[PDB]
């Protein structure tokens, strides 16, 4: 066994040397003389009420009008953000739900949690009444994230250190992704939906190929767990949030860390991240009840979205970049412009 | 637009009825190591990632959740239970002498105490191996001194209330084990969450009554704190 350890150490040293060799100048020097964005003064525009318990996940719709939010009172609610009406309200079987997804075509929604089951719901039923249409069983841990590929495929990540691909047609697991040593706390489909990442509790992010089912790279540099992740709009980088109270941006092609957003005042972890439409800002929700808009190309903070009375647990930006929704543990959703 | 408004009224009208049931029921989390005897308690009151046990006392409905089919790294899925009425923490008191189960339970309880998301959630404490601790201490196999140098000068606290016909050593050791957790609890508590030690067996009938009364006390304390009386 010692020889294998020595070989692994030598390979790690070689990778470190290559990463050092492929570095010539920091992104700051390249961005030495870019235009500062200036203070951002976004303000609330809406506020949705009706949830009883704290909110763990919200997802948008491809039309940037409807959205779905999940809480641990056992309810899935579909809001019409423009008019704030409630379109649907789904009473869940198990009240411990930790994620929700909205299908790209809008026909189905999915949600899972401590029950270790992903349930697919039908919204366009013949009678119109929403019914449980599928239950995907086979994960050995709580489900922490799920994402639709199309109306007949879904990718899920559970704390059992594995990500899976499901065939909604027969509900049989089609592929298994392995390699993490800690619970997988999130994932993110690529714009072309051929690659995705995952952030585990080992402080490492891995890049997968959806078809072959083999990991391609591994990015390190965080000090503690990673809670959230999201891909740059152009699909050649991404960002992550960690309990060490910092965010870092990795680039696939260069294969090493690019930037870090840290301030002395901030001593709390990040619970979510997301880029704007053009990928020049970086929203991120903190446990100190606030959000911060980071100047991605200079790392200098731009503004703050204060007004939440409790922890920020979820955060999403519409496809067209018109609105930002932020659920929170106070059971409210706020739309900001 | 009219068709949209009417449904919202119907949907909202439904959430009112669901708001009554949610507010009229209490949620309880059931923790404890595998060999702590919790499953016996659950069966007494009575693949899947979680189990349900709904019972009613004094026409008051409770709702208890037993973890299952999950890994041992609790520091992420534990936060989901930051809004429960109280957490039950069954301990294996007689498991003393893995070699040191008691120390494991001590560290787990200490970690629960100091987590920020749990600095307001009350924790009930069960020491659920009394009828085995009795034989362990009586037979002379215990020798708790070796694994606890601090138990050579321990003297039964003055306010002790031993049960009738009890060997003083048994009560002395039992109270000592309780005293460790009560020493952890009463440091940096700050009068926002509490602990309710309760010696118990594995088939004690009054467990439901004890949990009911402790829940009642928790609600009353919270209400009084709202009015700034306490």
């Amino acid at each position, epitope marked *: 066994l010692d020889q294998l350890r020595q070989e692994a150490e030598q390979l790690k040293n070689q990778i470190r040397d290559a990463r050092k060799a492929c570095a010539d100048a920091t992104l700051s020097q390249i961005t030495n003389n870019i235009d500062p964005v200036g203070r951002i003064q976004m303000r609330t525009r809406r506020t949705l009420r009706g949830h009883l318990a704290k909110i763990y996940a919200m997802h948008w719709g491809t039309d940037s009008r409807l959205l779905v939010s999940a809480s641990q009172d056992g309810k899935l609610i579909i809001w019409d953000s423009y008019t704030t009406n409630k379109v649907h309200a789904i009473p869940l079987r198990s009240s411990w739900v930790m994620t929700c997804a909205y299908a790209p075509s809008g026909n189905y929604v999915a949600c899972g949690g401590l029950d270790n089951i992903c349930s697919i719901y039908n919204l366009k039923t013949r009678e119109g009444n929403v019914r449980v249409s599928r239950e995907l069983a086979g994960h050995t841990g709580y489900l922490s994230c799920c994402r639709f590929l199309d109306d007949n495929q879904i990718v899920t990540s559970s704390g059992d250190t594995t990500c899976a691909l499901w065939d909604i047609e027969t509900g049989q697991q089609t592929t298994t992704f392995t390699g993490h*040593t*800690g619970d997988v706390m999130s994932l993110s489909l690529a714009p072309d939906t051929r690659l995705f990442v995952s952030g585990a*509790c*080992d*402080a*490492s992010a891995k890049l997968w190929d959806v078809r072959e089912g083999m990991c391609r790279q591994t990015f*390190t*540099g965080h*000090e*503690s*767990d990673i809670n959230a992740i999201c891909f740059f709009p152009n699909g050649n980088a991404f960002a992550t949030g960690s*309990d*060490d*109270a910092t965010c870092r941006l990795f680039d696939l092609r260069a294969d090493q860390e690019l930037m870090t957003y840290s301030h002395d005042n901030i*001593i709390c*972890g990040i619970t979510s991240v997301s880029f704007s439409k053009s990928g020049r800002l970086l929203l991120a929700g903190y446990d100190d009840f606030n959000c911060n808009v980071w100047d991605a190309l200079k790392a200098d903070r731009a503004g703050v979205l204060a007004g939440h009375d409790n922890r920020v647990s979820c955060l999403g930006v519409t496809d067209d970049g018109m609105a930002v929704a932020t659920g929170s543990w106070d059971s409210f959703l706020k739309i900001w412009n | 637009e009219k068709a949209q408004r009417e449904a919202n009224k119907k949907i909202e009208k439904q959430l009112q009825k669901d708001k009554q049931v949610y507010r009229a029921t209490h949620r309880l989390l059931l923790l404890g190591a595998g060999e702590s005897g919790k499953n016996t308690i659950v069966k007494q009151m009575r693949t899947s990632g979680i189990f349900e046990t709904k019972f009613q006392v004094d026409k008051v409905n409770f709702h208890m959740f037993d973890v299952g089919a999950q890994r*041992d*790294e*609790r*520091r992420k899925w*534990i936060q989901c239970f930051n809004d429960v009425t109280a957490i039950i923490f069954v301990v294996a008191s007689s498991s003393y002498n*893995q*070699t*040191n189960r008691l*120390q*494991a339970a001590l*560290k787990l309880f200490d*970690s*629960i*105490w*100091n*987590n*920020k998301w749990l600095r307001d959630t009350s924790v009930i404490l069960f020491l659920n191996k009394q009828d085995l601790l009795a034989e362990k201490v009586l037979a002379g196999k215990s020798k708790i001194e*070796d*694994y*606890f*140098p601090e138990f050579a000068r321990y003297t039964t606290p003055e306010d002790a209330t031993p049960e009738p016909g009890e060997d003083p050593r048994v009560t002395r050791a039992k109270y000592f084990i309780r005293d460790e957790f009560l020493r952890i609890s009463t440091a940096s508590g700050d009068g926002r969450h509490y602990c309710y030690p309760h010696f118990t067996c594995a088939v004690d009938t009054e467990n439901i009554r004890r949990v009911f009364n402790d829940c009642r006390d928790i609600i009353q304390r919270m209400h009084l704190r709202q009015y700034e009386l306490l």
Partner: nanobody
Amino acid sequence: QVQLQESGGGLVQPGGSLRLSCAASGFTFSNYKMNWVRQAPGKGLEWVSDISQSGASISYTGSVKGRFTISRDNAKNTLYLQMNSLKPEDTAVYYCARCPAPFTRDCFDVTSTTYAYRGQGTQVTV
């Protein structure tokens, strides 16, 4: 990345003494709590000692009190354990452990079967 490297192990007769140095790199040493965890043959993982961020507060397991003196040199980024008065049942691997989050007091999951920030370990035989 997080990487903990130990040293100082070896073989010694009963009542001997050894020093376990823990060379740590890849993070800010002074922001995190620390622990010592050992795994004896045919047994689960165990917890021995700890020390706070600055290094004031200390705590020992039940059956090592008065023998081992945890101490951390935050300047040189290393954790110590001065072993003395060893016994036959001290034989075990010793992992230098790190605590999952900084600035916090709660220190979940250090003893887990697959903790991620735990050291490689050194075998101390008596």
